[PDB]
């Protein structure tokens, strides 16, 4: 629950890794390549660089290294060899990391090629929609109202939020209390204080909420064929704000988020 600075200072070193994959990959993120490949490469790197593991292999079976996720995926896409990146596509690449114990959870939208209408509108919003939500996290405040300003934002564009997945508690264990919903609950109830750890990690879908698993059980669509984008950061709590541990160079919200003067 409370980690200790010696924690956070692993955390950030964690965090720092799972970024750095994401900037990594960013120039392979084109039309012809394989998201089996972009898999390998991620791996590879993971491994060979950055002496350290990807926490999706073996996860509850899960047969890849990170996600990729493509269009009207929602989540949990399985990098295929014969899988081909298409001009237009709007594609989530979801990393997790495991350096010296701890974890760093993070995934961002790319946009291959010529973006359309939907992709660019649908992926700004996203990203905007955990915008939002990092700069209220301070100790005091309640997940539910942070929940509660996501669904508020993403509804107002006229898009919905995905009901089953959520953030989480994050350190030793890839997902560990509190479960962060990105949505209006009753059962929220979360006081934020200084040195909790957790992501969040919105999926939103440009048209209805409902989601349906393939026949692999694995790879999640919009039941609607809807597009869907997520992004992900790993936070810190800290005692006036936040900070974001899974921030790369081509974020543009500041690391130290403080709401003190
Ligand atoms: C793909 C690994 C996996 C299996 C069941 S849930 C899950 C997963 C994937 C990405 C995440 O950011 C996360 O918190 C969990
Ligand atoms: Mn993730
Ligand atoms: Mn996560």
Same mark, same amino acid.
């Given at each position: ?5 010696? #924690? ?11 970024? $750095?994959?994401? &900037?990594?990959? $960013? ?9 089996? &490949? +972009?898999?390998? !490469?991620?791996? #590879? ?25 493509? %269009? &009207? ?7 295929? #060899? ?5 001009? /237009?596509?709007? *594609? ?7 350096? #010296? ?20 509108? +649908? ?18 405040? %309640? +997940?539910? $109202? !942070? ?20 953030? @989480? /508690?994050?350190?030793? /264990? ?7 919903? @990105?949505?209006?609950?009753? &059962?929220?109830? *979360? ?9 969040? $990690?919105?999926?939103? %879908? ?10 692999? /059980? ?17 936070? *810190? *709590?800290?005692? %006036? ?21």
């Amino acid at each position: 629950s409370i980690k200790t600075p010696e #924690d956070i200072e692993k955390m950030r070193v964690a965090g720092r890794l799972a970024a $750095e994959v994401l &900037e990594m990959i $960013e120039p392979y993120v084109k039309p012809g390549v394989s998201t089996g &490949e +972009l898999d390998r !490469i991620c791996n #590879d790197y993971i491994v060979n660089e950055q002496h350290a593991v990807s926490a999706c292999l073996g996860y509850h079976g899960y047969p890849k290294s990170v996600c990729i996720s493509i %269009n &009207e995926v929602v989540c949990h896409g399985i990098p295929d #060899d014969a899988k081909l990146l298409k001009d /237009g596509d709007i *594609v989530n690449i979801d990393v997790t990391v495991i350096k #010296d114990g701890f974890h760093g959870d993070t995934s961002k939208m790319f946009i291959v090629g010529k973006p359309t209408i939907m992709g660019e509108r +649908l992926c700004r919003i996203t990203q905007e929609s955990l915008y939002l939500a990092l700069r209220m996290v301070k100790p005091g405040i %309640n +997940l539910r $109202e !942070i929940g509660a300003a996501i669904q508020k934002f993403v509804e107002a564009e006229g898009f919905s939020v995905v009901r089953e997945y959520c953030g @989480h /508690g994050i350190g030793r /264990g890839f997902h560990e209390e509190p479960q962060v919903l @990105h949505y209006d609950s009753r &059962e929220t109830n *979360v006081v934020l204080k200084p040195g909790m750890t957790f992501t969040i $990690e919105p999926m939103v %879908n440009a048209g209805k909420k409902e989601i349906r698993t393939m026949k692999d /059980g694995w790879t999640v669509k919009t039941k609607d064929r809807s597009l869907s984008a997520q992004y992900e950061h790993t936070i *810190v *709590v800290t005692d %006036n704000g936040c900070e974001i541990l899974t921030l790369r160079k081509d974020d543009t919200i500041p690391a130290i988020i403080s709401h003190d003067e």
